[PDB]
């Protein structure tokens, strides 16, 4: 009957749909590889989808996926076993090298632009008409690392103009240079800003930005990467 | 075996239990100590379930059903064929679930991300525990739990419901449903919003978040924003399930009568209780 | 403890954002509204502006007419007494015409006519608002996802109070406007058709509802888990994969064996939610037109 028809029909629809859904999520990081980077033998039942090309605004060109994949940065890792499936140990300083939970991707070295073609993110000093409207203004508060030692002082807030949001705290270190600190990895308190991931001694290692009034996708990744990695690698310096 | 960008992430560490012992992968999958735990609990449980199936004398999945002990057994142990098997199976499920959560924690650490996912999952686990542990205890027999079978479980739902009248009147049930509906609404929108920006009209350039915020203020005069909608989703979801637990944990424990009748409180407020006319006067 | 990013710990404000100006008729957009610092702790603090236009007004006017046409009926039931009105608010009900009138538009007002008026108002209200979702997108050059997603919802509503009442031969088969009454109608609709738990569309529909919660839980917690690497900035992540997208995909690959991309995850999303009322609509449509009792149907399968 009709009902039987409809339901049998639907289970068929649903199956080609999953198939679709699945092949679309195969647009990045495919095809699969062996730990040595050579193409892996068994890529699953699903074919790579036919490529699609994105037209990036503000004449930043195009992106076609799937496409040639490459890390475009050295990886300082060495195998710890003779068969597949085991960890790869950092061969240096994982933090300094950017592997592990400290990994960063070679994103473009251009900043994210808003709808108008202006830098999406800005130090608040250069963002005409922005102010802390609620909560504790961090600016001026010392910054404490997981080792409970003071590392610097907030000397500005880098805001996201189109979404009117605090993205990073800029921090002034003992030598007078500054670093960005992701907003998402610090606790703003009444008398201090506490950073659990990094011990005071690692703040200097936080990668620097080439221009003082801009951050690029590459530098966001290298920074967030680094600060995140502290959680696992600063661990010996963290006390509470 | 690895995604084109996976290797630099596959470093040692992050394990909660047992150091480097189980710190490794199997194909795409991460094992970890709890990798093993869940496997063991999952193996055992499925076994017991098959064992129930022979005692039942059917291999047909639409028929197979593992029932809790009958009320006469209260919160004591029961013979295998008479409810023990379900009790173990329930222990094993719990073991599986919790372990699966703790593995999520272990992966979280290795990758250096937040614990929001293990977190949210614990709500699912807590809803399940409400229906097979917290409610039966409080009620006083494993027998109030739902049976493990594809349709028999739908039956428990239907019977348990109709016991208190039309269950629609359970007030926390009303609230819990509003989230389920609301969440789906919001998942519908979020998905649609991002896709429409990433896949504009033919030959046009990718839109920006600015467009997303504009599209919505134009539409309903407000936009919760890209960070917001993700906070929103997590919340509606967790809330739906939170109220779902609540509506059950109260049902049969502190309220055992017809749910519709509980509304008489409102209608019988002394200031309008006796005023004639309307529906109730 | 570590910061979780469920609530902002510092609010920043700037000049009211009047938004992108594509092909949008700027004469129609309103003025910026105030800013809720309340809202600001969760998401955006800025209210408005909003776009009026012709369809917005028609929609918005029919919308109120519907609501009010029901409202006066409730008052008439309450004996115009504000006390009764409050006491009995969820008990009042605007019911469709009796089965006697069939698909007739001649039912007396106290006997079903008023229901038709209200519905007519809702019909126009809803469709115009649909056209509104479409146009608003067109004017910004965006995909029409939202309008199509919306159409799914519309499907179930169309079926409940219009398509099914018409295929059954009478308006009496439609849903009454009322809080407790539309609950009862639902509960009763299942009883009559032999328990909707045997309607496999109903069962499918529940799977996608349950799933929507499962997914929006998964997606939300994930994006929050990696917002420490600017995860929420999904459009740029699509355009240039960040570590965020990577950690996201990998956490999931390592847990359950496969994974999404940032554009990908949102396709899972729109389809999981859209299938709820899509399947739903179908389950209800066959109910009572082709299948009288899902249990009997369940025994044979035809
Ligand atoms: C009876 C039911 C009737 C009830 C009415 C309710 C209908 C509600 C449907 C809502 C659909 C939501 C979809 C969301 C979406 O993608 O929208 C954007 C999508 C693109 O938007 P755009 O702005 O035009 O383009 C922007 C970009 O250029 C392009 O942007 P893009 O890349 O994002 O869009 C590409 C998109 C294009 O999307 C579509 O083309 C949409 C397809 C609509 C399908 C409708 C489902 C009907 C359910 C049938 C169930 C059977 C039961 C009987 O790709 C897909 O999503 C492909 C879907 C894959 C389907 C798999 C089919 C398998 C067939 C079986 C094969 C055998 C299997 C082997 C075994 O919109 C549409 O294409 C419109 C579809 C409208 C049709 C409505 C039906 C009319 C009646
Ligand atoms: C929480 C609310 C009620 C209840 C009310 C209902 C109602 C009402 C319905 C279901 C439906 C289903 N229920 Mg139930 N269900 C409950 C508790 C459970 C439990 C549990 C351990 O707590 C589980 C595992 C299930 C599982 C299921 C599926 C068989 C089915 C589709 C659900 C779905 O899409 O979810 C979304 C999740 C996903 C898409 C992720 C993938 C889920 C897959 C499908 C899981 C299948 C597991 C199953 C085959 C058993 C495996 C166990 C062993 C390892 C073999 N229910 C409680 C008692 N359930 C629907 C149905 O059609 O089944 C008859 C239906 O109509
Ligand atoms: C006793 C009750 C019966 C039963 C009878 C029914 C009936 C009858 C129906 C459902 C339906 C549904 N049931 Mg059932 N159901 C039962 C038990 C259950 C259980 C359970 C036991 O755990 C669950 C989980 C469900 C779950 C569900 C949903 C999956 C499904 C509706 C999805 C939806 O989101 O629509 C919500 C979305 C809409 C209604 C879309 C409307 C969109 C419109 C356009 C909104 C306009 C707004 C308006 C103009 C006002 C404006 C707003 C103001 C400005 C604020 N049922 C039992 C067996 N169920 C529906 C279905 O699809 O079944 C197959 C349905 O018709
Ligand atoms: C795919 C399935 C899900 C879905 C999707 C969906 N719904 C949608 C969309 C989509 C994709 C839209 O684009 C569209 C939308 O614009 O949302 C922002 C819509 C929408 N879904 C809505 C509601 C809705 N969707 C629902 C369900 C669902 N929608 C599904 C679960 C439900 C239910 C019953 O679960 C409801 C109630 C609307 C918010 C919106 C469609 C708006 C519309 O058509 O308006 C027409 C008429 C008016 C303008 C009426 C206004 C009259 C009011 C002023 C009266 C009430 C006054 C009241 C006392 C006010 C106070 C409220 C307080 C909280 C402050
Ligand atoms: C809290 C909000 C919602 C939510 C969230 C949620 N679910 C989650 C997560 C999150 C955040 C995960 O991270 C985790 C996941 O990895 O998803 C891919 C998970 C998950 N949610 C799942 C299912 C699921 N979630 C559901 C619900 C929900 N999940 C909510 C609505 C439902 C239902 C019925 O609504 C189901 C069916 C899994 C796909 C996955 C967890 C997988 C897992 O725990 O693996 C460990 C266990 C096994 C491999 C099998 C164990 C076998 C048992 C020992 C025996 C079988 C016993 C069982 C009781 C029989 C039941 C029979 C039925 C017919 C009744
Ligand atoms: C870019 O822009 C944006 C998006 O992106 C695309 C969006 O998606 C959206 C769209 C999102 C929305 C419209 C979501 C808005 C959310 C809501 C209106 C909330 C949803 C939830 C509800 C309606 C449920 C309300 C329930 C409440 C308040 C209950 C509170 C708690 C209690 C009463 C206590 C419980 C205790 C009980 C019952 C005790 C019982 C005792 C005995 C039985 C005894 C918007 C607006 C947006 O702007
Ligand atoms: C933006 O970012 C995001 C991503 O990517 C960038 C993502 O991918 C995802 C994840 C989401 C998707 C890929 C979309 C599709 C997902 C769903 C519809 C959810 C439903 C899921 C399932 C049905 C799969 C359930 C599968 C499970 C639990 C695992 C299957 C497992 C097995 C067969 C074996 C289980 C493992 C065992 C026994 C232990 C380990 C193994 C040993 C041998 C030991 C999200 C949410 C996301 O937000
Ligand atoms: C404060 O008092 C005043 C008077 C000021 C008020 O305004 C108060 C007002 C309230 C008390 C209002 C309360 C309103 C509610 C309780 C409403 C509840 C509504 C629901 C629960 C609705 C549920 C389901 C509705 C459904 C499925 C409607 C479907 C409608 C349609 C598909 C429309 C079909 C079209 C029809 C039959 C006519 C078509 C005619 C043509 C010519 C095309
Ligand atoms: C996480 C534990 C879940 C267990 C589910 C039910 C187990 C019942 C345990 C009772 C065993 C014996 N008793 C009555 C003497 O306590
Ligand atoms: C978006 C893809 C995920 C879809 C989930 C498919 C599994 C649902 C199984 C429901 C069982 C249903 N049925 C028809 C017997 O009632
Ligand atoms: C519904 C769950 C689907 C998970 C898919 C997992 C893909 C695994 C690919 C094969 C890897 C094989 N193995 C375990 C033999 O090494
Ligand atoms: C109801 C949800 C079911 C999810 C559908 C299962 C998809 C499995 C995809 C496995 C992909 C294998 N691969 C390529 C990663 O090895
Ligand atoms: Fe998202």
Swiss-Prot record, chain A:
Belongs to the reaction center PuhA family. GO terms for cellular component: plasma membrane light-harvesting complex; plasma membrane-derived chromatophore membrane. The chain crosses the membrane at residues 2-21. It is found in: Cellular chromatophore membrane. It is a single-pass membrane protein. This is Reaction center protein H chain. Residues 22-240 are cytoplasmic. Its cofactor is a bacteriochlorophyll; a bacteriopheophytin; Fe cation; Mg(2+). InterPro entries: Bac_photo_RC_H_C, Photo_RC_H, Photo_RC_H_N, Photo_RC_H_N_sf, PRC-brl_dom, PRC_barrel-like_sf. GO terms for biological process: photosynthesis, light reaction. One of its GO terms (molecular function) is bacteriochlorophyll binding. Its main location: membrane. The reaction center is a membrane-bound complex that mediates the initial photochemical event in the electron transfer process of photosynthesis. NCBIfam families: puhA. It holds the Pfam family PRC.
Curated annotation (Swiss-Prot), chain B:
GO terms for molecular function: bacteriochlorophyll binding; electron transporter, transferring electrons within the cyclic electron transport pathway of photosynthesis activity; metal ion binding. CDD domains: Photo-RC_L. InterPro entries: Photo_II_D1/D2_sf, Photo_RC_L, Photo_RC_L/M, Photo_RC_L/M_CS. Fe cation binds at residues 190, 230. Keywords: Bacteriochlorophyll, Chlorophyll, Chromophore, Electron transport, Iron, Magnesium, Membrane, Metal-binding, Photosynthesis, Reaction center, Transmembrane, Transmembrane helix, Transport. The chain crosses the membrane at residues 32-55, 83-111, 116-138, 171-198, 225-250. Residues 1-31, 112-115, 199-224 are cytoplasmic. Its main location: membrane. GO terms for biological process: photosynthetic electron transport in photosystem II. A ubiquinone binds at residue 216. GO terms for cellular component: plasma membrane light-harvesting complex; plasma membrane-derived chromatophore membrane. It is found in: Cellular chromatophore membrane. Residues 56-82, 139-170, 251-281 are periplasmic. It is a multi-pass membrane protein. (7R,8Z)-bacteriochlorophyll b binds at residues 153, 173. Reaction center is composed of four bacteriochlorophylls, two bacteriopheophytins, two ubiquinones, one iron, and three highly hydrophobic polypeptide chains (designated L, M, and H). Belongs to the reaction center PufL/M/PsbA/D family. The reaction center is a membrane-bound complex that mediates the initial photochemical event in the electron transfer process of photosynthesis. This is Reaction center protein L chain. It comes from Cereibacter sphaeroides (Rhodobacter sphaeroides). The gene is pufL.
Curated annotation (Swiss-Prot), chain C:
A ubiquinone binds at residue 252. InterPro entries: Photo_II_D1/D2_sf (IPR036854), Photo_RC_L/M (IPR000484), Photo_RC_L/M_CS (IPR055265), Photo_RC_M (IPR005781). Coiled coil: none annotated. Pfam families: Photo_RC. It is found in: Cellular chromatophore membrane. Fe cation binds at residues 219, 234, 266. The keyword Ubl conjugation does not apply. GO terms for cellular component: plasma membrane light-harvesting complex; plasma membrane-derived chromatophore membrane. It is a multi-pass membrane protein. Reaction center is composed of four bacteriochlorophylls, two bacteriopheophytins, two ubiquinones, one iron, and three highly hydrophobic polypeptide chains (designated L, M, and H). NCBIfam families: pufM (TIGR01115). The reaction center is a membrane-bound complex that mediates the initial photochemical event in the electron transfer process of photosynthesis. Belongs to the reaction center PufL/M/PsbA/D family. This is Reaction center protein M chain. The gene is pufM.
């Amino acid at each position: 009957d009709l009902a039987s028809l409809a339901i049998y029909s639907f289970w068929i629809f649903l199956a080609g749909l999953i198939y679709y859904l699945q092949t679309e999520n195969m647009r990045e990081g495919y095809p699969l590889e062996n730990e040595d980077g050579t193409p892996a033998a068994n890529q699953g039942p699903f074919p790579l989808p036919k490529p699609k090309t994105f037209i990036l605004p503000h004449g930043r060109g195009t992106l076609t996926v799937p496409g040639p994949e490459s890390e475009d940065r050295p990886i300082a890792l060495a195998r710890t076993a003779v068969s597949e499936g085991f960890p790869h140990a950092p061969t240096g300083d994982p933090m300094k090298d950017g592997v592990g939970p400290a990994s960063w991707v070679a994103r473009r070295d251009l900043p994210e632009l808003d709808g108008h073609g202006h830098n999406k993110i800005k130090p608040m000093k250069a963002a005409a008409g922005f102010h802390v409207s609620a909560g504790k203004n961090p600016i001026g508060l010392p910054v404490r690392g997981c080792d409970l030692e003071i590392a610097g002082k907030v000397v500005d807030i880098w805001v996201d103009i189109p979404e009117q949001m605090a993205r990073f705290l800029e921090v002034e270190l003992k030598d007078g240079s500054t670093r960005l600190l992701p907003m998402q990895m610090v606790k703003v308190q009444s008398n201090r800003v506490h950073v659990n991931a990094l011990s005071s001694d690692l703040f200097a290692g936080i990668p620097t930005i080439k221009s003082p009034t801009e951050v690029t996708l590459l530098e966001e990744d290298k920074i967030c990467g680094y600060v995140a990695g502290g959680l696992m690698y600063a661990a010996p310096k963290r006390k509470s | 075996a690895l995604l084109s960008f996976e290797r630099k992430y596959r470093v040692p560490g992050g394990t909660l239990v047992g150091g480097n012992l189980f710190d490794f992968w199997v194909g795409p999958f991460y094992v970890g100590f709890f990798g093993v735990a869940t496997f063991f609990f999952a193996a055992l449980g499925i076994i017991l379930i098959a064992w129930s199936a022979v005692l039942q004398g059917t291999w047909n999945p639409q028929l197979i059903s593992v029932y809790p002990p009958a009320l006469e057994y209260g919160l004591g142990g029961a013979p295998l064929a008479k409810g023990g098997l379900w009790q173990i199976i329930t222990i094993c499920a719990t073991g599986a679930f919790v372990s699966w959560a703790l593995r999520e924690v272990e992966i979280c650490r290795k990758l250096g991300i937040g614990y929001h996912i293990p977190f949210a999952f614990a709500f699912a686990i807590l809803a399940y525990l409400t229906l097979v542990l917290f409610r039966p205890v409080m009620m006083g027999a494993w027998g109030y739990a739902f049976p493990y079978g594809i349709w028999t479980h739908l039956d428990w739902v239907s019977n348990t419901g109709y016991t208190y009248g039309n269950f629609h009147y359970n007030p926390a049930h009303m609230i819990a449903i509003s989230f389920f509906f609301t969440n789906a609404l919001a998942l519908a929108l979020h998905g649609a919003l991002v896709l429409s920006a990433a896949n504009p009209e033919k030959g046009k350039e990718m839109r920006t978040p600015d467009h997303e915020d504009t599209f919505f203020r134009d539409l309903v005069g407000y936009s919760i924003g890209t960070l917001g909608i993700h906070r929103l989703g997590l919340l509606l979801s967790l809330s739906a399930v939170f109220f779902s637990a609540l509506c059950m944990i109260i049902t049969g424990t502190i309220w055992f009568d017809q749910w519709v009748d509980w509304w008489q409180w409102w209608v019988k407020l002394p200031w309008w209780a006796n005023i004639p006319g309307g529906i109730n006067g | 403890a570590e910061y979780q990013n469920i609530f902002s710990q510092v609010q920043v404000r700037g000049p009211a954002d009047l938004g992108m100006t594509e092909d949008v008729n700027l004469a129609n957009r309103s003025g910026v509204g105030p800013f809720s610092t309340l809202l600001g702790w969760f998401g955006n603090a800025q209210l408005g502006p909003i776009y009026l236009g012709s369809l917005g007004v028609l929609s918005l006017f029919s919308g109120l007419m519907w609501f009010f046409t029901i409202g006066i009926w409730f008052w008439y039931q309450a004996g115009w007494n504000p006390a009764v009105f409050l006491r009995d608010l969820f008990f009042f009900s605007l019911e469709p015409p009796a089965p006697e009138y069939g698909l007739s538009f001649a039912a007396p007002l106290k006997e079903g006519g008023l229901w038709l008026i209200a519905s007519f108002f809702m019909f126009v209200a809803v469709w115009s608002w649909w056209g509104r979702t479409y146009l608003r997108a067109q004017a910004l050059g965006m995909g029409k996802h939202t309008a199509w997603a919306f159409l799914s919802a519309i499907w179930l509503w169309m079926v409940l109070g219009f398509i099914r009442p018409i295929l059954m031969g009478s308006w009496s088969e439609a849903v009454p406007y009322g809080i407790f009454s539309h609950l009862d109608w639902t509960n009763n609709f299942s009883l009559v058709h032999g328990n909707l738990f045997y309607n496999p569309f109903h069962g499918l529909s529940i799977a996608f509802l349950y799933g929507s919660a499962l997914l929006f839980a998964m997606h939300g917690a994930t994006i929050l888990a990696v917002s420490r690497f600017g995860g929420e900035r999904e459009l740029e992540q699509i355009a240039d994969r960040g570590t965020a997208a990577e950690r996201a995909a990998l956490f999931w690959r390592w847990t359950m064996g496969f994974n999404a991309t940032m554009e990908g995850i949102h396709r899972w999303a729109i389809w999981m939610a859209v299938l709820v009322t899509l399947t739903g609509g179908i389950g209800i449509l066959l109910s009572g037109t082709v299948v009288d009792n899902w249990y009997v149907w369940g025994q044979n399968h035809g």
